[PDB]
Each structure stands twice: as structure tokens, then as C-alpha cells.
Write a protein that binds this ligand. Structure first.
Ligand SMILES: [Fe+3]
Lengths: 197, 197
């Protein structure tokens, strides 16, 4: 059955941008719940052998909400890391600077897309089927995988992602998340070995 | 312009079911923000003279999300109170026991409807146009007023309504909310002077 992927870093590794408490709750409880619920939902269905990506790509209803949320969260943890942040270099940086004009202007628009997500949702930086870059905002457990797009970066805006550390100040959370982005991971997604399982 | 209604009780009046901190944030900040945004949104539009209820009933988009969230919150604060909880008596109790079988089974189903709201939303107990009782779950700022139904009771399940006190334990929040319900207010809505502003 599906399993909860260990955190790619220590629980206190992302301080002081995201507390250890936030990670314990967000990863140990919330993420875990989605995993548990997915494992209770797949038995006896046509999703019994499929892979996470496979399920979120063909499922709907409650199976989807949980499957997509598990993936979204695993992907999300990888988009972050200690001693990171900064900017992307190489082809990624060119794709961004060419699609958004500059990295600072990409952050501006990525921030607007995230913060402007009404309610529970996610902010995304994706690569379309034509290799072009694009921003997307999903609500709930919405995942770019279902539109054939390729996720390069994501930002969880569900209130539990930041309430402990920023309360209602969602913008201050997004701003501090920039200091944790794992551009190496984003780059890998951009063009190379895309994240799976 | 629209104003933020004072809390019907002290900020620490609902302890220990809902902390004073939760009320200061939920009411003083979140509730207030929806008010402030509504006031920036209505000027120059066709909602310039209307009432809160009028706006949430004929608006859409961002004007709606803010108008309905202001209403939902004001209504919500009234559905709670110190030295309350218990059960409804009279005609309300009859309508409940007749629609749900018993008050305990109504709580079961109301709880299921609330907790089962995926993401940000609200749990409701309404009275349809044919006087029958019904449960509803809205996402985001969804309000039963727009369906011509009559809200009797509501439970905010946006994570900010309980994260400070229960974190991811939404169920323990709903369970503690029952100890705060102001049934007199719910009764008023059931049949009589319905809430205004
Ligand atoms: Fe709220």
C-alpha cells in the first residue's frame, strides 16, 4: 500500500521560514491522513495496482482528493530545502526570464497566483506540452498532472501550511517560502528526470 | 459603508471551546478583512446602496466572496454564546426530531456534513421554502441565502476557525462547537424574526 515519504530534511531544517511544529503537523498528520484515507479507498477498486501519479490522473471524487493531496504534498516537500532559495540558473532561468521577463517578475506573478487562491488550494509553476512556462492556481486538491502539464514548483496555500507561523498573513508566508525553494529540484522537473512515485 | 459588528460577547466568553486568541484573530482580523475588501469593492458598482443580504443574493465573483463571508461570519458569531449549548425545544426540536429522528442523530449528520467539507467551507442547518429541515455544505463563501433557503445554524470549517485550538483535529472542534450553540438564535431563525444587517 502507499506510504508516507519521510521528510527530505529534518523537521526543523526550514526554520525560521517554516517552523518545526508546522512540519510535524503538516507532514506527520495532515499528509499522513491523506495517505491513510487513500489506502482505505483504493481496496477493491480499479486503482488497486496503479501508481500515485496514475491514480490522480484517472480518479475522481474522494479517491482523487486524497491521491492528489498526497502527491501534491510530497512534491511540495521536495520543492523546499535548507540552504536553498536564491534563483534558478541555466535553461530554467532562461525559460523563466523569457516567459516572465525576469525572476523578480516571476515571483511577483507566482505570489499573486498563490495568495489570490480563494480558500484551500495550491499555487503552481508549470511547463506546458509545448515546453512553455505557465502559472496555475488549483483549489482543494487540484493537480496540474490531470491537464497533461508538468509541475516544476508548488506552494501550498491551505491555511494549515502557514497558520501556525503566520496566522492570516498568507503573503508573509509566500514571501518566506522563496527563501526555501529547491531550484535544483525545480530544474530537474523543468527538463530531465521528472519526479515520480 | 459596511462595518464590522462587535462580538455578541467578550472575546474570552467561549472558552475553553474556542480560545480568546481564536476570536481575536477570526473576528478582529479575518472577519474585518472581508469587511474592508467589501467596502473597496462596492463603490462605483450597482451594489452601492444594497444591504449585505441583498449583495450576497445578487452578487458574484470577488464582491460575492467577500459579502457572503462577512454575512457568514456575523451569522456564525450569533450561532454561538456562553452558557448555552444544550438542545432546542419547541417547534424547532420537533422539526429536527422529525427530519433527523432525534437531536443526537442530527448532530451526527451535521458533524459529518461539516467535517466532510473538503478544504475551506461551512456546515449548515437550513429550513427550505417548504418548511422542511435540511443540511448543507458550502465551499469557500457559499451561502444558503442564494438558494432561497433559510440558514438556522452554521459552523465555520475554514481551518482558521480552529487551527489555533485544535490544529488538524477538525472533529474535536465541531464537537466543542456543540457546547456553544445559541439555540435561542437558531429558533429565532427557524420561525420568526430572521437575522438582518
Ligand atoms: Fe471564518
Amino acid at each position: 500500500a502507499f506510504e508516507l515519504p519521510p521528510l527530505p530534511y529534518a523537521h526543523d531544517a526550514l526554520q525560521p521560514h517554516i517552523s518545526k511544529e508546522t512540519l510535524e503537523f503538516h507532514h506527520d498528520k495532515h499528509h499522513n491522513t491523506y495517505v491513510v484515507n487513500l489506502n482505505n479507498l483504493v481496496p477493491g477498486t480499479e486503482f488497486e495496482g496503479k501508481t500515485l501519479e496514475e491514480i490522480v490522473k484517472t480518479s475522481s471524487g474522494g479517491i482523487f482528493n486524497n491521491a492528489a493531496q498526497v502527491w501534491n504534498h510530497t512534491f511540495y516537500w521536495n520543492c523546499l530545502s535548507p540552504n536553498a532559495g536564491g534563483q534558478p540558473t541555466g535553461a530554467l532561468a532562461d525559460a523563466i526570464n523569457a516567459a516572465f521577463g525576469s525572476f523578480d517578475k516571476f515571483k511577483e506573478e507566482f505570489t499573486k497566483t498563490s495568495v489570490g487562491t480563494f480558500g484551500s488550494g495550491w499555487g503552481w509553476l508549470v511547463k506546458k506540452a509545448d515546453g512553455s512556462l505557465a502559472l496555475a492556481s488549483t483549489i482543494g486538491a487540484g493537480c496540474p498532472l490531470t491537464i497533461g502539464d508538468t509541475p516544476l514548483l508548488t506552494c501550498d496555500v491551505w491555511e494549515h501550511a502557514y497558520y501556525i507561523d503566520y496566522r492570516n498573513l498568507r503573503p508573509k508566508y509566500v514571501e518566506a517560502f522563496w527563501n526555501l525553494v529547491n531550484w535544483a529540484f525545480v530544474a530537474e522537473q523543468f527538463e530531465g528526470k521528472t519526479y515520480k512515485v
